[PDB]
Short mmCIF file of C-alpha atoms and ligand atoms in Angstrom, two decimals:
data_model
loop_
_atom_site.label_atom_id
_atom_site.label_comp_id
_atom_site.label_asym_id
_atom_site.label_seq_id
_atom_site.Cartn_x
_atom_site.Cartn_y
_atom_site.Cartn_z
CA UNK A 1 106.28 111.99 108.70
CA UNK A 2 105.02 111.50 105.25
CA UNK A 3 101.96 113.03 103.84
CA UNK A 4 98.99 111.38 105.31
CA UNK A 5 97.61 110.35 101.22
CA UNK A 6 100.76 108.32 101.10
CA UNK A 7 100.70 106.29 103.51
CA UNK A 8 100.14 102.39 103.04
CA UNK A 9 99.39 99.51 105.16
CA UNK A 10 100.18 96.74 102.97
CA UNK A 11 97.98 96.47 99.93
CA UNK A 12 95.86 98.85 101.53
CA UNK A 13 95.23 102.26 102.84
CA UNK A 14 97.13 103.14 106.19
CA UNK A 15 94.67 103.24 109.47
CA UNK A 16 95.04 107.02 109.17
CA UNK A 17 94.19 107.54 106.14
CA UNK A 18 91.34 105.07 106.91
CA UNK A 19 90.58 107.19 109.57
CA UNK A 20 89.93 110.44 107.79
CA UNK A 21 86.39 111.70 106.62
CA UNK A 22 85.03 112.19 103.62
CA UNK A 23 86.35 115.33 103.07
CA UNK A 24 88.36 117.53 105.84
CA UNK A 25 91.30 120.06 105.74
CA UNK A 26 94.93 118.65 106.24
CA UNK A 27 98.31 120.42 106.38
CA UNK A 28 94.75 121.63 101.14
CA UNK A 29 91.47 119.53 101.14
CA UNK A 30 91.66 115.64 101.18
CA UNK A 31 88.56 113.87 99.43
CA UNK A 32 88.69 110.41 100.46
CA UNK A 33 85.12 108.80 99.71
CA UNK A 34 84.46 108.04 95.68
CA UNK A 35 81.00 109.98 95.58
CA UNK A 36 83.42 113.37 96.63
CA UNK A 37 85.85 112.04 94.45
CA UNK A 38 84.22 111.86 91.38
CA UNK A 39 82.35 114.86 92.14
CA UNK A 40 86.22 117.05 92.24
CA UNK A 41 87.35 115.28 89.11
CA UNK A 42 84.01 115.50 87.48
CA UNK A 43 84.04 119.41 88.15
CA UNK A 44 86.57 120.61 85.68
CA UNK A 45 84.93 123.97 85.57
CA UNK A 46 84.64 124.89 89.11
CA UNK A 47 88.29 122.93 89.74
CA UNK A 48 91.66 123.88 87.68
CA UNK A 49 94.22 121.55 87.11
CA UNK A 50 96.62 124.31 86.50
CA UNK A 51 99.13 125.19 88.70
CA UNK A 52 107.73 122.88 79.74
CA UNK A 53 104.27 122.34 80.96
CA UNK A 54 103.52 122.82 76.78
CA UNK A 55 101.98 119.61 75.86
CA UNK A 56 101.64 118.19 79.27
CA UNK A 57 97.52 117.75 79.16
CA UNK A 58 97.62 117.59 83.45
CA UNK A 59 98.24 121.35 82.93
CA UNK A 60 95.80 122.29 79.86
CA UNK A 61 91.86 123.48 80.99
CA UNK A 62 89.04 123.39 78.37
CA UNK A 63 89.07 124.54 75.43
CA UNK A 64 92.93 124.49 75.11
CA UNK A 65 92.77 121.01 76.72
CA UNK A 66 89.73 119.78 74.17
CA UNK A 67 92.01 120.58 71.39
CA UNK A 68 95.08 118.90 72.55
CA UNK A 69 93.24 115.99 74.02
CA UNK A 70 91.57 115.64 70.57
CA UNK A 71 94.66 115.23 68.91
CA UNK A 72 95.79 112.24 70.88
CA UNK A 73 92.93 110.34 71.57
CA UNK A 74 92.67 108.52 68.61
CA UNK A 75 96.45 106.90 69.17
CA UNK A 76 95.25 105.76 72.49
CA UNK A 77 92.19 103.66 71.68
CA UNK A 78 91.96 100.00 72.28
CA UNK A 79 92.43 98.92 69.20
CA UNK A 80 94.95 100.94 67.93
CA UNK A 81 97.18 99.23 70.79
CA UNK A 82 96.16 96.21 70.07
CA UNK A 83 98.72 96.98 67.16
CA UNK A 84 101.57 97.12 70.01
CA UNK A 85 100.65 93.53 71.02
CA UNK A 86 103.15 91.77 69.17
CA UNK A 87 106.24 94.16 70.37
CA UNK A 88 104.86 94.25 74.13
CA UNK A 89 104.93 90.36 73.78
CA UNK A 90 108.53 90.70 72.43
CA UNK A 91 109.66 93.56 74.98
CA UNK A 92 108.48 90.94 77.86
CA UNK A 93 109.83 87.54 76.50
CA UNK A 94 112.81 89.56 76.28
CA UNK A 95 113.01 90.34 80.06
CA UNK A 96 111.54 87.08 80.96
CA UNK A 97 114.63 86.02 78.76
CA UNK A 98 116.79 88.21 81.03
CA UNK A 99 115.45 86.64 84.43
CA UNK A 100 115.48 82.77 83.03
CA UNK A 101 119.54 83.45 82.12
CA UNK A 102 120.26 84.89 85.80
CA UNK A 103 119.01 82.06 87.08
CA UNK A 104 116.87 81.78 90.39
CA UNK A 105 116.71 84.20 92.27
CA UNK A 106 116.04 86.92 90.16
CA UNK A 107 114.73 90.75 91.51
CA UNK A 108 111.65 91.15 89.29
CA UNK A 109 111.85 94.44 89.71
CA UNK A 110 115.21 95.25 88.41
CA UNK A 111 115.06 92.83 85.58
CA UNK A 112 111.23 92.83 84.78
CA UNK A 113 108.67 95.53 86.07
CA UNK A 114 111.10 98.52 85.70
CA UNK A 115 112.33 98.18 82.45
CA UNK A 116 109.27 96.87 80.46
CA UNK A 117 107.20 99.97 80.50
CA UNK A 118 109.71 102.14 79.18
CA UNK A 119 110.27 99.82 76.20
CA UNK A 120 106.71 100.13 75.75
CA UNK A 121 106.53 103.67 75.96
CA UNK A 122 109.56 104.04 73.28
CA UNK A 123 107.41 101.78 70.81
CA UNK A 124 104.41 103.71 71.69
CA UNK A 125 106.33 106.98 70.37
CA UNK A 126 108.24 105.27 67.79
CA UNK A 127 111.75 105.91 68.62
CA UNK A 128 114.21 103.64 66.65
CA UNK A 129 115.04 100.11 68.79
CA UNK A 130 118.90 101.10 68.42
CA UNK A 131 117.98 104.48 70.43
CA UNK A 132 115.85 103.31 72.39
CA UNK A 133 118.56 102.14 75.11
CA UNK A 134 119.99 105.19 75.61
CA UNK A 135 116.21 107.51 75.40
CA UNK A 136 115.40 105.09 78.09
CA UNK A 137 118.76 106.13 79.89
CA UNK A 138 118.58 109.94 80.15
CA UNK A 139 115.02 109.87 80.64
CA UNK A 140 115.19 107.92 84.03
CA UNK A 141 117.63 109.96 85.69
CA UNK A 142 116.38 113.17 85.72
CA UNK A 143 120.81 115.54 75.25
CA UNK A 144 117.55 113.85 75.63
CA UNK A 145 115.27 116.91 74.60
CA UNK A 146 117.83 117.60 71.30
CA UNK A 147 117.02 113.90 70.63
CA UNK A 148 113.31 114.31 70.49
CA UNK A 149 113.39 117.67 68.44
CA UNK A 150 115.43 115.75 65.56
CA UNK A 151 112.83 113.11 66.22
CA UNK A 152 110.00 115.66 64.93
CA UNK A 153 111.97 117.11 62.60
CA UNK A 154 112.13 113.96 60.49
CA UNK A 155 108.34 112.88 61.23
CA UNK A 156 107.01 116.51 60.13
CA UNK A 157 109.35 116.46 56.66
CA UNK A 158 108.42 113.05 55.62
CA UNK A 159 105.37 111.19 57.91
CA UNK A 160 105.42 107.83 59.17
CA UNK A 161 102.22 105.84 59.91
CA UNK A 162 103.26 105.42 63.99
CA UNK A 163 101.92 107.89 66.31
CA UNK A 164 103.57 110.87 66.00
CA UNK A 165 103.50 110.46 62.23
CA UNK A 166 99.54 109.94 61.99
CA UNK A 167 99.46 113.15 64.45
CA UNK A 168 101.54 115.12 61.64
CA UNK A 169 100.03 114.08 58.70
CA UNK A 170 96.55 114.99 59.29
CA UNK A 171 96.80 117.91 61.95
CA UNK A 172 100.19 119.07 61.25
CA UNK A 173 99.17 122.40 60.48
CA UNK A 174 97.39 122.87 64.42
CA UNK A 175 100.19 121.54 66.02
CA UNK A 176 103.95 122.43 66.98
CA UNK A 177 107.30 120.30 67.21
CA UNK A 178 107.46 122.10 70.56
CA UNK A 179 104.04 120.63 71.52
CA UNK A 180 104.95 117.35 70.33
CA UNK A 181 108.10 117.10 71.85
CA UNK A 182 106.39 118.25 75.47
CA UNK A 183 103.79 115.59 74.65
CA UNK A 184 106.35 112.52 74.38
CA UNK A 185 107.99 113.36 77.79
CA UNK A 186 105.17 113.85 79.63
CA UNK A 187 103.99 110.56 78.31
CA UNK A 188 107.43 109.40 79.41
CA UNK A 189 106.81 110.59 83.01
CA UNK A 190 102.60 109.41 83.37
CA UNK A 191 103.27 106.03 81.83
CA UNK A 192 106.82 104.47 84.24
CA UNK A 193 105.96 104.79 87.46
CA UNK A 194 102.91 103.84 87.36
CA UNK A 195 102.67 101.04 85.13
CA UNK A 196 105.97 99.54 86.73
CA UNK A 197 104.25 99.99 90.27
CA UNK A 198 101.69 98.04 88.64
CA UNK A 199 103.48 95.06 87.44
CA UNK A 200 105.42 94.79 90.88
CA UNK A 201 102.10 95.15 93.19
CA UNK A 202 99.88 93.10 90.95
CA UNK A 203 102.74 89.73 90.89
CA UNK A 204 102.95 89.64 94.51
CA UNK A 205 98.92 89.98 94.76
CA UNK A 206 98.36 86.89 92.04
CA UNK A 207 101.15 85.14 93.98
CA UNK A 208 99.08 86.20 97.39
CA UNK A 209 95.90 85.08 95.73
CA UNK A 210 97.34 82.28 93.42
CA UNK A 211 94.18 80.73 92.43
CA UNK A 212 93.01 83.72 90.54
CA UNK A 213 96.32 83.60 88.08
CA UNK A 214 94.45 81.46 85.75
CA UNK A 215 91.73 84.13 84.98
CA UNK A 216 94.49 85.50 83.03
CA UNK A 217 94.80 82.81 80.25
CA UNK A 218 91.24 82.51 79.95
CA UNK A 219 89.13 84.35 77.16
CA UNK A 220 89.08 88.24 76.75
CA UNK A 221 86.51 89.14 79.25
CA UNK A 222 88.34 86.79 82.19
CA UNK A 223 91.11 87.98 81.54
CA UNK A 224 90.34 92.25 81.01
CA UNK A 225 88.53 91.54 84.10
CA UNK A 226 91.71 90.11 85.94
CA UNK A 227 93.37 93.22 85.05
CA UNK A 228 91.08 96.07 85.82
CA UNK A 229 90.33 94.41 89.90
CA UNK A 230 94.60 94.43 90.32
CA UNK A 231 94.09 98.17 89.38
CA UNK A 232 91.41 98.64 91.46
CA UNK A 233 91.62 96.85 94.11
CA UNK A 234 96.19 98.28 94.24
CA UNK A 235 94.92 101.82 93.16
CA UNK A 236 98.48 102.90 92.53
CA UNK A 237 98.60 106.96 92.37
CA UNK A 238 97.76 108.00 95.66
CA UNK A 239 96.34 111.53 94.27
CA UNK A 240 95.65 112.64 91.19
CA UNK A 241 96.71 116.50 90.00
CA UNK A 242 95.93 118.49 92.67
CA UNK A 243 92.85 120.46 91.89
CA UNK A 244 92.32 124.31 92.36
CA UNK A 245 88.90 126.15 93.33
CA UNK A 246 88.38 128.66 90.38
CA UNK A 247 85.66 130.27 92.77
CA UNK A 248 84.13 129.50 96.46
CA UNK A 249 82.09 125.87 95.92
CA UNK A 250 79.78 123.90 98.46
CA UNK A 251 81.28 120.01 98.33
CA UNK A 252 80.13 117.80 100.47
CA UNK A 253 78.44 120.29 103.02
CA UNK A 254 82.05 121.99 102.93
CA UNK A 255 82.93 125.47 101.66
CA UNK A 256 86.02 125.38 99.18
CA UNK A 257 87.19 128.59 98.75
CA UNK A 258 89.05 130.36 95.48
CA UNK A 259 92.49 129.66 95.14
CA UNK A 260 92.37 126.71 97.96
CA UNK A 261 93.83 122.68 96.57
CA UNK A 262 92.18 119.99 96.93
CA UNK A 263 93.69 115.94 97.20
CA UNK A 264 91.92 113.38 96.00
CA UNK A 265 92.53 110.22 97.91
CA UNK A 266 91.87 107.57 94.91
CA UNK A 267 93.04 104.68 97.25
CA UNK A 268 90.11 105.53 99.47
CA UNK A 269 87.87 106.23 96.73
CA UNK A 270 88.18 102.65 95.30
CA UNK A 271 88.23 101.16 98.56
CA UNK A 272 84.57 103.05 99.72
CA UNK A 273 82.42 100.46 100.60
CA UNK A 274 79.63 102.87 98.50
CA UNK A 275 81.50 101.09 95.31
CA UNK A 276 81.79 97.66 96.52
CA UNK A 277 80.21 96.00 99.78
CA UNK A 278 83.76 94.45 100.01
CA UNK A 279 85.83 96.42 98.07
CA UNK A 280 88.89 95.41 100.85
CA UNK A 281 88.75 91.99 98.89
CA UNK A 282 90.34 90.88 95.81
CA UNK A 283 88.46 88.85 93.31
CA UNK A 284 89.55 89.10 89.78
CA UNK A 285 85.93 87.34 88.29
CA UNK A 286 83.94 90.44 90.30
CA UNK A 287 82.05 92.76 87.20
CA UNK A 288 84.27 95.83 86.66
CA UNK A 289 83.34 99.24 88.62
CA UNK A 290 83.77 102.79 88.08
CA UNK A 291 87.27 103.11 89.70
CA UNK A 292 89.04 106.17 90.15
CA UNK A 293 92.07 104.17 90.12
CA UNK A 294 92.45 106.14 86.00
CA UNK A 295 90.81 109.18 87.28
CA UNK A 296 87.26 110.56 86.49
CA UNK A 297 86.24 113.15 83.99
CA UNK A 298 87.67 114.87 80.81
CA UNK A 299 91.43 114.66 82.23
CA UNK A 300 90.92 110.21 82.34
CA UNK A 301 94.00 107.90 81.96
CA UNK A 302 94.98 108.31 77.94
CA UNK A 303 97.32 105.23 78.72
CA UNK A 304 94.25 103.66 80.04
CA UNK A 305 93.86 101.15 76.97
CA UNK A 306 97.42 100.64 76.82
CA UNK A 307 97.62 99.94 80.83
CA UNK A 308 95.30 97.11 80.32
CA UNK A 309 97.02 95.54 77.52
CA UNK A 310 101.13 95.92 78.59
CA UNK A 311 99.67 94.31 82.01
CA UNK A 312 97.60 91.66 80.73
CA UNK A 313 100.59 90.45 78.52
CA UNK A 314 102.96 90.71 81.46
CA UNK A 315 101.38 88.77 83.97
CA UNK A 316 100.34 85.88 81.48
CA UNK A 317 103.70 85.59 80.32
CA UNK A 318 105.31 85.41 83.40
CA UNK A 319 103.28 82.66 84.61
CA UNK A 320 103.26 80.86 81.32
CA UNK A 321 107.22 80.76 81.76
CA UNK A 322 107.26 80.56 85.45
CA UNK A 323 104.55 78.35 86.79
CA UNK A 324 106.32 77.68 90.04
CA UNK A 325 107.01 81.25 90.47
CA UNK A 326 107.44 81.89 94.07
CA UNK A 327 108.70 84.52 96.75
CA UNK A 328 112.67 83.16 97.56
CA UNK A 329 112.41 83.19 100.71
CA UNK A 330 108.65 82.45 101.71
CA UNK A 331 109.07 84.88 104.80
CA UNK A 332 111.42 87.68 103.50
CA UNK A 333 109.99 91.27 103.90
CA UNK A 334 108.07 93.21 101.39
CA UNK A 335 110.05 96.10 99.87
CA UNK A 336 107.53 98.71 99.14
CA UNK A 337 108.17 102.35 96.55
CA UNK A 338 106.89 104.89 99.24
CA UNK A 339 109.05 107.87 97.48
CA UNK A 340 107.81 108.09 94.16
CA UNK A 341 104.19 109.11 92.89
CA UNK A 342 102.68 105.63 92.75
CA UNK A 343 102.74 102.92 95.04
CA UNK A 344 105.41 100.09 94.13
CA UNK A 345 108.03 97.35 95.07
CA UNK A 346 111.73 98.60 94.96
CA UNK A 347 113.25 95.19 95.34
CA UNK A 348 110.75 91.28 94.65
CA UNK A 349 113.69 88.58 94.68
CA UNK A 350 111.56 85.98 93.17
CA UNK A 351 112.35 81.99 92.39
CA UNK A 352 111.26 79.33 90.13
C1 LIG B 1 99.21 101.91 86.07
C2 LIG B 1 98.59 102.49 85.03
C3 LIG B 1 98.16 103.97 85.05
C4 LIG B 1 97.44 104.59 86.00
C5 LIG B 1 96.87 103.96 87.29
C6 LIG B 1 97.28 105.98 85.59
C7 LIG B 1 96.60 106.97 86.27
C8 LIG B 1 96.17 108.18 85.75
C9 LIG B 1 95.28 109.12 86.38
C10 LIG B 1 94.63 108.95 87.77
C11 LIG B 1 95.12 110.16 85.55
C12 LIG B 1 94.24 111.41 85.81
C13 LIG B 1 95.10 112.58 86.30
C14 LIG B 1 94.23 113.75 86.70
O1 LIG B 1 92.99 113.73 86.46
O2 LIG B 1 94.79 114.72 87.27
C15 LIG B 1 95.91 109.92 84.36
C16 LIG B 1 96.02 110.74 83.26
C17 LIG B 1 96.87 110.59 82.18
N1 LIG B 1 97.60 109.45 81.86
FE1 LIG B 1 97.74 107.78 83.12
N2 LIG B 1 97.92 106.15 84.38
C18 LIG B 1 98.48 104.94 84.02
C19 LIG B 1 99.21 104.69 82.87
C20 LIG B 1 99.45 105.57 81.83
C21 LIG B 1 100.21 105.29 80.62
C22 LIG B 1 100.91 103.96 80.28
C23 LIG B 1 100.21 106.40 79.87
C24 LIG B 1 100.89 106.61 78.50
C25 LIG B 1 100.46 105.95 77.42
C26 LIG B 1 99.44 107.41 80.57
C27 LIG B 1 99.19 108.69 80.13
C28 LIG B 1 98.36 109.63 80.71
C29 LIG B 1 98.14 110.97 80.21
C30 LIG B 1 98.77 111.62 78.95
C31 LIG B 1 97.15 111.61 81.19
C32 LIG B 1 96.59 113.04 81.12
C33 LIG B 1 95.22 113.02 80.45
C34 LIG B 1 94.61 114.39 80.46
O3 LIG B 1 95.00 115.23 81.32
O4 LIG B 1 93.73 114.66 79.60
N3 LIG B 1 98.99 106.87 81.75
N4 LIG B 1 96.54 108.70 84.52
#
C-alpha cells in the first residue's frame, strides 16, 4: 500500500524495492542503482526540478538557481558552522539536561532528536532565543510568516553579522525580503525531518553496533568518518525532488520522454554494491564514498556541512553523558517514521 521507494525493511531497503531494476516504470521512472542515479541528478539540463516556491532552491533551474545558490553558499561552508559549535553543544546539553531530569526511561525522540534540529535551525537563521520557542511552534504544525517579514525588516535597516545579516549587507541590493523570508522556511522544512530522522536512526545503529561509538570521540577524521557511514549506510530521504524530462533522453538503455518524472531511489543508490562490495554493512572506520545520501549535482545538500557537525555533537554527547545508554526493554519493538519524507523513529524509550 505505500509507494514502493518507501518502503523499509529495517535499516535497509524493503525486498521489493530490492527487487526492482536499475531503472523501470512504476505507478514515473524509479532509478535505483547509483551509476543511474548520479547520472539523473547530474543532468540538470536535460532534468527540471520544477514542478511560495520563491526562495525554495528545490524549485529554481540554472541561471536563476546559480544566482540564488550563490548567495547562500558561503553561510553554509564548514567553517562558517563551525561558528554554531558552541550553541549546538548548548542546544544538546540542554536536551540531554531534559532526559537526565525525567529520569530513566526517557523517549529520545520526544525529548532529544525532535527538538534539537529546530533549535539549530533557529540559530542558523538568527531568530532571538526568547522567540525561538514559539517560531519552533507554528512552524511544526503546519503568524509565523508576519514573524519572519519583521525579522527582515530589521536585518535590511540595520545588518547584523549572522546569516541573514551578512546576506543583506553585501548583496542586499540583488535580493528581496520576500526571497529571504521563502529562503528561511524552506530551510525550516529541508533541515527537521531529516536531520531528526538522523539522530533517531543513527542512536539505535551505534547502540546496534556499540563498538563503533568510540570512533566518535576520537580525532576529526574518526570521527567525520563516523558520521558520514550513519548517513550512508541509513540514507534517510527515500527520493530526492522528483525530476522532469525537459526533452526525450536515452538513460540507461531506456527512453525518458518530455514531460515524464523520474524517482530516484537514494537508499538503493548507496546500498549498490557498484559503491561498496558490502555496502549492506556498517563500519564507521570504512574511507568515505560518493553517497547520494545529500544528493548529486548543482542542487547538493546546503545543510550538508551543518548535518555533519549538529550530528557529530549529538551522538558524542549523548554517550559522553550516557555511557550505559541502552534500549528499556532489550526486546521492545522498533517504532519506525514511515509517513513523513525521511526515514525515522517516532517513539526510542531509552535507559541509562
Ligand atoms: C540528515 C541530513 C540531510 C540530508 C540527508 C539531506 C538531503 C538532501 C538532499 C538529497 C538534497 C538534494 C535534493 C535534490 O537534489 O532534489 C538536499 C538539498 C538541500 N538541503 Fe538537505 N539534507 C539534510 C539536511 C539539511 C539541513 C540541516 C539543511 C539546512 C541547513 C538543508 C538544506 C538544504 C537545502 C536548502 C537544499 C536545496 C539545495 C539546492 O536545491 O540547491 N539540508 N538535501
Amino acid at each position: 500500500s505505500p509507494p514502493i521507494h518507501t518502503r523499509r525493511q529495517g535499516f535497509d531497503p524493503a525486498d521489493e524495492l530490492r527487487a526492482a531494476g536499475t531503472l523501470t516504470k512504476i505507478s514515473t521512472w524509479l532509478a535505483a542503482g547509483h551509476a543511474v542515479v548520479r547520472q539523473v541528478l547530474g543532468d540538470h539540463k536535460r532534468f527540471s526540478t520544477r514542478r511560495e516556491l520563491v526562495g525554495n532552491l528545490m524549485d529554481y533551474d540554472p541561471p536563476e538557481h546559480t544566482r540564488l545558490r550563490h548567495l547562500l553558499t558561503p553561510g553554509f561552508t564548514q567553517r562558517r558552522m563551525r561558528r554554531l559549535a558552541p550553541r549546538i553543544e548548548e542546544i544538546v546539553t540542554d536536551r540531554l539536561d531534559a532526559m537526565e531530569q525525567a529520569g530513566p526511561p526517557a523517549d529520545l525522540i520526544e525529548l532529544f532528536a525532535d527538538e534539537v534540529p529546530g533549535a539549530v535551525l533557529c540559530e542558523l537563521i538568527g531568530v532571538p532565543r526568547d522567540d525561538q520557542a514559539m517560531f519552533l511552534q507554528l512552524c511544526h504544525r503546519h503568524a509565523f510568516a508576519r514573524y519572519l517579514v519583521a525579522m527582515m525588516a530589521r536585518e535590511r535597516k540595520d545588518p547584523g553579522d549572522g546569516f541573514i545579516g551578512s546576506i543583506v549587507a553585501e548583496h542586499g541590493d540583488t535580493i528581496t525580503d520576500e526571497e529571504l523570508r521563502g529562503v528561511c522556511v524552506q530551510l525550516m522544512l529541508a533541515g527537521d525531518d531529516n536531520v531528526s530522522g538522523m539522530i533517531g536512526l543513527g542512536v539505535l545503529a551505534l547502540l546496534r553496533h556499540p563498538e563503533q561509538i568510540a570512533a566518535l570521540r576520537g580525532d576529526d577524521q574518526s570521527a567525520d568518518r563516523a558520521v558520514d557511514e550513519l548517513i550512508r549506510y541509513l540514507t534517510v530521504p527515500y527520493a530526492p525532488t522528483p525530476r522532469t524530462a525537459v526533452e526525450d533522453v536515452m538513460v540507461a538503455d531506456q527512453v525518458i520522454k518530455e514531460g515524464e518524472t523520474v524517482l530516484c531511489s537514494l537508499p538503493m543508490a548507496n546500498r549498490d554494491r557498484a559503491l561498496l562490495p558490502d555496502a549492506d554493512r556498517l563500519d564507521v572506520t570504512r574511507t568515505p564514498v560518493p553517497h547520494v545520501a545529500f544528493g548529486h549535482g548543482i542542487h547538493h545538500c546546503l545543510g550538508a556541512a551543518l548535518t555533519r557537525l549538529q550530528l557529530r555533537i549529538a551522538y558524542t554527547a549523548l554517550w559522553r553523558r550516557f555511557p550505559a545508554l541502552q534500549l528499556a526493554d532489550p526486546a521492545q519493538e522498533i517504532m519506525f517514521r514511515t509517513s513523513t519524507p525521511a526515514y525515522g523513529l517516532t517513539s526510542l524509550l531509552v535507559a541509562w
